[model samples]
Target chain A: EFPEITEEMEKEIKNVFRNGNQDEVLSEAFRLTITRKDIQTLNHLNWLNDEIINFYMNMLMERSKEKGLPSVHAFNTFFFTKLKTAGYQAVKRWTKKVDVFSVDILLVPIHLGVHWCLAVVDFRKKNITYYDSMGGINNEACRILLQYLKQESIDKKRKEFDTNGWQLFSKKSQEIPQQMNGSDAGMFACKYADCITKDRPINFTQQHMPYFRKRMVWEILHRKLL
Target chain B: ADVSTFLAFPSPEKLLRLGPKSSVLIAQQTDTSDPEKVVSAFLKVSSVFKDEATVRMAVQDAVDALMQKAFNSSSFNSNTFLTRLLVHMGLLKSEDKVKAIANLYGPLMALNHMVQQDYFPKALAPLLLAFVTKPNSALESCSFARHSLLQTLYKV
Candidate 1:
């Protein structure tokens, strides 16, 4: 394949993929679509599934909303077709919700702690209320989310929460909470919550969702109509 | 723990940030121009010692040079060559100019032979084919040459 195609042709393709910009996010996705070999490779990988694609897309959308970035439908739609053509089953699996409080909540201290609870609400936006006591949690649930301008501070907070407070179990507990804050940190989560909250109804066309909405991949895949 | 052993190895991040250009220069291997010295210096990095973590990063630098070296030799202009081969192959993109991009590139069996050293082409061909075949048009049809040439001069 040496000189199978000219060096000039190679440059053009790279430009289209790299510098031929429309939007960074969308262009990157399209370029990836054109470059990738076959859907079978995706199917060979588990993430090509509807459930996973939906989850990842929701992650992207949520951050976009939180960061006030555009959650272009192209981001989701292009990837959806991409994964589908790549052999993702395109099934939309409805996610089951878990009840709030100490069982899952207290596990936080053992697994993480208060900051973990805080981030879960702000980024994930599935409201939480666990604390020193239960009813107090609704007030805990009322906590204000911090908006950060820098990634370092978000990292600091993640480190702080992970290392903060007295560990009942150990002297050297160094585990950190999942990080949040900073520009675009939870755009996907925020937009996803917004979509589910507003539509009150989850819609999946071919388990298809509106580009930015959050729905499980399985649900989206099985969704009857767009 | 001999910190010296650790010191003997450069930081992978440092190598990546400085890139291959400076890394090769630091070893004074550029003057000797020895391929073995160049590779050995590369492996001397703490990151490279952790083969799993650093191989991909190192290969990326290798690909960079391979392309730049191509630019130094080719009849085509640098911009045109990259735009055509890398972008059309979907290996790189235009908007990525300011941004750091990631990809595996270069003459496939050759780069693979260099990387694997001992691996046979029979073993490598399928993997190469898998990567190139993703968007599913024939490899022959990619439009890198025209795009790169056109972008540079605005004439096909």
Candidate 2:
């Protein structure tokens, strides 16, 4: 049976927004609070914050681990931004703890000033995929990750990674659902990650974003995937 | 070892002075860079040391040093990103302040970002095309916030 939200789940989610439990500590690791400010981002016409994105990613990881599914790792939104505005050397130490190659999927939430996109380093599939909901072309983003993998291997493994084994690409708008407006971009990125991690098809569309927001609130609150 | 590269890093102030040309010598350290490149260089120095407190002070010192030269407004612009950054701090308004600020940070912002969707670019551009642009819009905040705050009260 597929996981889906029911009326009871919906009610708890509504109270979260309407009752104003904004300052509640939703996640312990990041010590994240889905403050009124952050919650507002999930509502229509606003940008999603890293707090929401990172938290949901944890939900995905928790699910994958619960069922003994392929393990996943996610990076903070600023990691990619710092890598861009500031450079690789600026952000090299970000991964000193985890061996990136060990995970089935490595989720990188890229915040490009105004835009939000996700990159997946799938070691199992030998793919570095970039997904931008706006349908923007981002081969360089994929290439950067490939380059990061090479360096990470050298730095941590004390040897080089065979870059030739990896394939770098971004999904075309026609191949994947595209966003109609600016605000939904962050949500689209999140959902795209949600779908990919489960080996679920990228069948969700632009219209699914609003419901996805409401559903995401419930899932993040319960700390489970639906 | 990359340790030497890290050890050889020039102070943000020194990098600011030496320009990118000497960074390789310093590690010794291109934008087709002139002045803005110095900022890219400084950002690198800022990154390597991992102590932003020191970097901000270095940035402050450079601005403090430049402000002495102008003593000096043409609305804003500068050949160097450091001087251009003063426009955002409201520190570089004379001798053409506005345009210089735009050109300096705009490129850096555009590097891996889609500035088209950012509120700063969207709101400021047409508005500034009317004159032309913002400070916190470029840097979320700057060291000169107190500089401006203190100067305003003191002048009054």
Candidate 3:
């Protein structure tokens, strides 16, 4: 059962969005509506993996206060580009076997290159159990970076968070989480990146060829051509 | 030692007319569980603290009704939730707003009392967790909405 719509909550929400601090800006009106209604959400939408592309785009369009939400192209160039470039770096460093490939070292550049990457989030579980560095693509990373920049802009005025607000911009290159191989998919990735180090390029397995082809296609087509 | 000083006790109506500022005295034997008794007690208290107290109580009722109706009935329109919130925010003075506040005042006041007593994190943890998802602002109305609602929940 939902509450009847009143004008006051609406005003409060608009006030928050248009002028409140980060917490206040989020607004009580919108929050109450969501609580009472089954508002749509983007669960587990990954930019790197290109999951929920449509849903996310739609959300971006509908939610924006500024008219004509930024195009997917703009978002892609600014956000996804870095991830694609970084993915190529990781892929180029692959060799030993198909199963034990690791992209952690390769992903460092992308992590530094973009803002914050996102993974699929399921609220009901209350546990981030899955193991996949699914987001952090260049385009998505850019989006995240901009988001941080915006927050940093707002936080600068506050007492707790100072001018060093966007300092993440400086240290970002070192902060990206190293890709780890603990999941069922990890064993294979570890071998892949581990084999083809700067010392020796491990181009030994027929199984490795397909993945490399796909990665190259991802780079040339996704990053450049598309 | 019995010196009978005849001091007249003011009635609930008179006290309620004063608004939320009036000190309310709950009878030792008041039947709070009964809606009628509750209504009577509310009216009696209302006389002393007529304006702001009643206003707060009225909105609280709306919230409860909206929650019950939306959750209990499939046919109830979901949009009603937003309406109720706006009403609670005090933008509208419609009939539903009035009834909602009156009906839900008890629970709302109780919740407020609990908050004052520092029973927030313990009593409301589950509900808070369930409702407050998505820390993002640029997402859909839901994300923005969830963000705000979470704050209100915290305020409570």
Candidate 4:
């Protein structure tokens, strides 16, 4: 069942969005725990809108800045969309504002129709890691991100990502737990990024799913990040 | 339902009346849904305890119990999630609470101890750095606690 949004919450949500508080409302929507089949997310099974994932990614970057950790920049969901529809030059405009090569971490939330997966470019680790909760490894996704990184580097810094240690791989392991059902892939992708950005170890299990489901809601409300 | 919202604010007095059992109950429901209400409940309950140690112990125990369930039942990253709540209750502010948090940190270390050195310091750096930086610079005024935590992290 969907968690009912109260009238007061609707007002606040609407007011925040309407009052030019796009970031705040986006953050709340990103944090809201309820899911509906009509809207595409079920109680425990759901996929996040690209907007929500993108906003969450930006929030992580802001949180990193507030904490004095290395800066993290996440490419908007449109990067992949544009890349697929148009071509390299078409997506090049997105890299103009901030030099993509300067950031320590670059997050790419890839939307494959109904499913959501994540690919991260860790400049420090020199690895592009793909995390798919469903355990379907996409070497291609990793390669695409690697190509994007190299392109961004040349465009921004007039150089290439040093392959001396640069690598592309999937975190998918048979030894690890994969999603038993649909819907939880989005949560897995978000959690995977959360661990990497914080430099914490990744040790997720199917057993921890419900806790994570609740935990994300709590974390969003508190505005208290790790 | 029209007037209700997702980020509901509950009274601290009522939350305290609900006490620790109520706290746990709210946590269970909050675990799956209605998290904003529980966050309010958590803040309220923390304020009810006169002594800081009691508050720390209660929060610690509540989080520990919630995390003990099967891994699939929840998110596996308990340290970050629970530690945030503990920090909300001022976990790093005083020496006593830091020691108490260190105790809570013990089990998590054993459970996910792949990092050779304990995991607390590694996980702790980013959180502390946030407080000490611009905007939240005032939060870094707690020099003794900050220095102590930093020292511990450096030693590791």
User: Which candidate tops DockQ?
Assistant: 2
Q: CA shift at A80, candidate 2, in angstroms?
A: 1.2
**Between 3 and 4, whose TM-score is larger?**
4
| TM-scores vs. true structure, each candidate | 0.23, 0.59, 0.19, 0.48
lDDT of each: 0.28, 0.59, 0.29, 0.53
DockQ of predictions, in order shown:
0.02, 0.03, 0.01, 0.01
Query: Per-residue CA lDDT of candidate 3, range A59-106, in tens?
Result: 222233233322111122123344345543333223223111111111
Docking class of 4: incorrect
C-alpha-based local distance difference test score of model 1? 0.28
Candidate 2: give the TM-score of chain A. 0.89
Query: Model 2: per-residue lDDT, tens digit, A147-194?
Result: 777777888899989866679888887898988764687788888888
Candidate 3 all-Cα RMSD: 23.9
* Cα distance off (Å), candidate 2, residue A15: 2.6
Best by TM-score: 2
Least accurate 10 contiguous residues by lDDT in model 1 chain A: A106-115
Q: By the lDDT metric, which is better: model 1 or model 4?
A: 4
Q: Model 4, DockQ value?
A: 0.01
lDDT of 2 by residue, B28-57 (tens): 122223444444433343333323664444
Model 1 per-residue lDDT tens digits across residues B1-156: 222233365554555555445433443332223332333332333123223445455544543443333333434243343233334334322322221212222223223333332222234234333334333223334345222322323211
The local lDDT score (0 to 100) that residue A85 gets in candidate 2 is: 68
